[PDB]
Write a protein that binds this ligand. Structure first.
Ligand SMILES: COC(=O)C[C@@H](C)OC(=O)C[C@@H](C)OC(=O)C[C@@H](C)O
Ligand SMILES: *[C@@H]1O[C@H](CO)[C@@H](O)[C@H](O)[C@H]1NC(C)=O
Length: 318
């Protein structure tokens, strides 16, 4: 199936994600700040360009990664390898961490906050910590097969007594109509992540939730891109990220399409930015340089694929 064009305003696009998907969300929010022009959200991710000049595990396990060079790179690349960082001064930025997360962690997420603080507007930043939550996607309902919010294990989606999807979307878009807590009006569509929509480390197929109101094109809709983390691709947990995270509940009543690009496990070994080589058996988004030296810059193969998907969807704006 081909990815459809919808009546989506190009000025209403944003992105969020968990963990490696949170890292990627920030990579998109920075490198393509012009495309993701409303803002972005990061759940338990870390600094833009964190892993380029220090080993990636230093950007994990609740350590204190350096952001001296990453921040310098943002300044240096502005307007060339990434969109002008001036854009970040007019973006809504949502950030979340569990206080008990020792996989990425408060100390890592705080460095992302500090890094973006060089470029953003504090009034338009929301940084939230959920006490007791580990490395997992925070929701406020018992999604099928959810792990405990106090134990980090597959599918890494939990009832943390906190509606993370709603918090992120409401922060990014401002007011929203109450979420739909019952039968959704729309459908989850599948499309081929092929050609310009695809990249190494990405699955053959992606998904998007389209509310009934966005189907005809009679109504202008917005677009949020939601990125799963490692071990959360469709290959790993089927439709559980798409359904259990709670984005669609909010989208359904707010003329919003949610795009869910899909990574795929890749057992092959790749040279990465520093520290030698690494495989991607968990199907993570590329924040370490698996698929090229420009993973977090314009032209990064995965970011380019996601942006290509976005460009197609908004090309139907009337
Ligand atoms: O744990 C997680 O999945 C969080 C995530 C941010 O960490 C990673 O992305 C780990 C990745 C960079 O390394 C791998 O998973 C490769 C594997 C062979 O170790
Ligand atoms: C803050 O975000 C709002 C969107 O809600 C935007 O209109 C405004 O320009 C931003 N504020 C500043 C001064 O950047």
């Amino acid at each position: 199936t081909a990815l459809p064009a919808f009546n989506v305003n190009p000025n209403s696009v944003s992105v969020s994600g968990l963990a490696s998907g949170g890292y990627m969300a920030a990579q998109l929010g920075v490198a393509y700040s012009d495309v993701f022009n409303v803002g972005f959200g990061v759940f338990a991710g870390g600094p833009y360009d964190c892993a380029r000049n220090q080993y990636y595990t230093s950007c994990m396990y609740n350590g204190y990664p350096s952001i001296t060079t990453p921040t310098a790179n943002m300044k240096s690349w502005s307007g060339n390898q990434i969109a002008s960082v001036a854009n970040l001064g007019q973006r809504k930025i949502y950030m979340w961490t569990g206080s008990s997360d020792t996989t990425v962690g408060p100390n890592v997420m705080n460095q992302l906050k500090a890094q973006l603080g060089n470029f953003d507007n504090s009034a338009n930043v929301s940084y939230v910590t959920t006490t007791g939550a580990v490395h997992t996607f925070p929701t406020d309902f018992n999604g099928a097969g959810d792990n405990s919010c106090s134990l980090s294990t597959s599918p890494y989606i939990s009832n943390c007594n906190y509606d993370g999807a709603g918090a992120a979307l409401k922060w990014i878009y401002g007011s929203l109509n109450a979420r739909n807590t019952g039968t959704l009006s729309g459908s989850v569509l599948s499309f081929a992540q092929s050609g310009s929509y695809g990249a190494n480390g990405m699955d053959t197929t992606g998904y998007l939730y389209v509310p009934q109101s966005c189907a005809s094109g009679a109504t202008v809709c917005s677009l949020h891109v939601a990125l799963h983390g490692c071990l959360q691709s469709y290959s790993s947990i089927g439709s559980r990220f798409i359904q259990n995270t709670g984005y669609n509940k909010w989208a359904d009543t707010n003329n919003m399409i949610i795009l869910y690009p899909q990574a795929i496990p890749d057992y092959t070994i790749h040279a990465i930015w520093n520290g030698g080589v690494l495989s991607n058996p968990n199907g993570c988004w590329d924040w370490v340089g698996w698929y090229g030296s420009n993973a977090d810059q314009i032209g990064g193969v995965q970011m380019a694929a996601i942006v290509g998907q976005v460009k197609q969807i908004v090309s139907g704006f009337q």
